[PDB]
Every structure is written in structure tokens, then in C-alpha cells.
């Protein structure tokens, strides 16, 4: 199987209220394992998964150091962005950065990520070749030139193939029971009259992991999109995920509709019907 490790950094300036707030969260696949928040009462990297809580003091001291350094870099970048875009220090601004690696089944790097947005819009991203950057605007082109000048892509690649993969492997081993296990959804179909002539069929998938899932409706075996509603996959709050998909149907035609569910945890795809 393929796995991923990703970090998500968010920095938000707040003029008149001191330094920008920095938040970092780390994920292995769809499981959060660490958090750092500069507004925490005692800012430090904190465990959010049992399979990392066990790491010795070295790990927490070093992760805390790196999180703080990342926050510093983000503050510097916020200042720089004020320069690039000719913006006032009195306005609030946001930087978002995601980066990480995909470990392939063969054990080598499958894919790398390093991308950032400024005020909610693409700023700069590492291309598929892992060697070049896409700059979203003229401002980001300054950054592109700087990074070409200081071999940033190469050094990041060194991280991808180095510590990123090594730690991903390590976490996968230390928490195999929970990380390498795919929990299938518990599914069912409910029926909710809309009027005396129409009704809603809702197909539920609960308690599943990982988050990836497919949920569709068919009529007489044909794919249905008209009059359907699929909600965003949502967290259960316990490390699992949920989703439902509904379709409005003419009363009396319910038994021609089937819900189809695909998930890694299922031996076979599901074909479900309203079971009154």
C-alpha cells in the first residue's frame, strides 16, 4: 500500500496583537499525530496519536525547535509579502504551507509536495518534476528566482528522500495496528418523505478509515446525478470518517434505486437498497 506524511502550517498576522499566530499539524495518511500552536499556554510540539507519544525527549525538543523555526520563517515571509504586494502592516494576512512525501509500496518516493498560498490564493508550488516551481504571480516570481539561486528544490528533495521517508516508515511501523488497518464503513439506507409524491433516499457510510470513499446512486443500474446530494466527507471525531448521499425519487420507484459504496476496507463493493 501507499502512504503519506504531510505537514500543514498556517500563519496569521494580527496587527496590534503581537506576533503572528502559527499553527502546525502533522498527518500520516488521514491520521493527525502532532500539533504545535504558538498561542498554546506553553507552545511545544504535542502528541495527538498514541504511536508517537512514546517518542523520547529528543523528539519533542527537536520538533519544538523546528516548529518555532518554521514560525520564524513564516513571520519573515509575511514581512516580505508586505513588501512584494505593497501592503500595510495594519492589515491582517495569511500564509498557508503544506509539504510532505508519499511512500510507495516499493519503499521509494512516490510523490513530493511543497506548496503555499498567500491570503488564500496560490503563491508558489513545487512542480511534478520535483525540480521546478510554479509561481502564481509576479510577487511569487521573486521567490522563484531566490529559490533557483539557493538550490532550494534540491535541498528539499534531499529531505523528501531522506528524513521524510525515514520518519514515515518509522511511524508506519510504530503504529501499524492503527495506521495500516482499513476499517470498512457501516452502511445503511434511510427513507424520508418529501411530499405525498416524492421521497428522499439517503445512503449512509459511517465509521470508516481512511477517508477515501466512493458513494453513488443508480436507478435500474444506471448512474444517477439528477436530484442527488452528496455531502463532504466529515470526521466522526474519533479518527473515523462519515459520508452520505441522497436522491429524491418518485414515490413508488424506491425499489429501483441502489446505493453503491467503494472503500479500501470492504472485501467487495456494496450494493444497498432501502430495506423498510
Amino acid at each position: 500500500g501507499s502512504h503519506s506524511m504531510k505537514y500543514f502550517y498556517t500563519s496569521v498576522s494580527r496587527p496590534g496583537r503581537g506576533e503572528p499566530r502559527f499553527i502546525s499539524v502533522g498527518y500520516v495518511d488521514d491520521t493527525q499525530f502532532v500539533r504545535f500552536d504558538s498561542d498554546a499556554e506553553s507552545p511545544r510540539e504535542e502528541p495527538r496519536a498514541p504511536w508517537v507519544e512514546q517518542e523520547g525527549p529528543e523528539y519533542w525538543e527537536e520538533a519544538t525547535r523546528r516548529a518555532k523555526e518554521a514560525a520564524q520563517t513564516h513571520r519573515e515571509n509575511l514581512r516580505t509579502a508586505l513588501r512584494y504586494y505593497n501592503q500595510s502592516e495594519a492589515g491582517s494576512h495569511t500564509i498557508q504551507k503544506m509539504y510532505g512525501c508519499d511512500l510507495g509500496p516499493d519503499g521509494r518516493l512516490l510523490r513530493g509536495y511543497h506548496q503555499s498560498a498567500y491570503d488564500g490564493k496560490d503563491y508558489i508550488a513545487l512542480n511534478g518534476d520535483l525540480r521546478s516551481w510554479t509561481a502564481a504571480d509576479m510577487a511569487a516570481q521573486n521567490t522563484q528566482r531566490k529559490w533557483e539561486g539557493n538550490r532550494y528544490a534540491e535541498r528539499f528533495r534531499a529531505y523528501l528522500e531522506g528524513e521524510c521517508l525515514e520518519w514515515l516508515r518509522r511511524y508506519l511501523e510504530n503504529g501499524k495496528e492503527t495506521l495500516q488497518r482499513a476499517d470498512p464503513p457501516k452502511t445503511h439506507v434511510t427513507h424520508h418523505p418529501v411530499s405525498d409524491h416524492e421521497a428522499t433516499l439517503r445512503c449512509w457510510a459511517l465509521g470508516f478509515y481512511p477517508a477515501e470513499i466512493t458513494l453513488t446512486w443508480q436507478r435500474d443500474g444506471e448512474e444517477q446525478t439528477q436530484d442527488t446530494e452528496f455531502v463532504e466527507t466529515r470526521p466522526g471525531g474519533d479518527g473515523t470518517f462519515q459520508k452520505w448521499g441522497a436522491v429524491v425519487v418518485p414515490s413508488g420507484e424506491e425499489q429501483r434505486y441502489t446505493c453503491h459504496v467503494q472503500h479500501e476496507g470492504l472485501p467487495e463493493p456494496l450494493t444497498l437498497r432501502w430495506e423498510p
Binding site: 518554521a70 520563517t73 519573515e76 515571509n77 512584494y84 511569487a140 535541498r155
Partner: peptide, 10 residues
């Protein structure tokens, strides 16, 4: 650690 050591300044 897993945290990126290299710092990318804009």
C-alpha cells in the same frame, strides 16, 4: 525529526 529543517524564505 520529521519537521523540514530547510527554511524556504520568500
Amino acid at each position: 525529526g520529521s519537521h523540514l529543517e530547510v527554511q524556504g524564505y520568500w
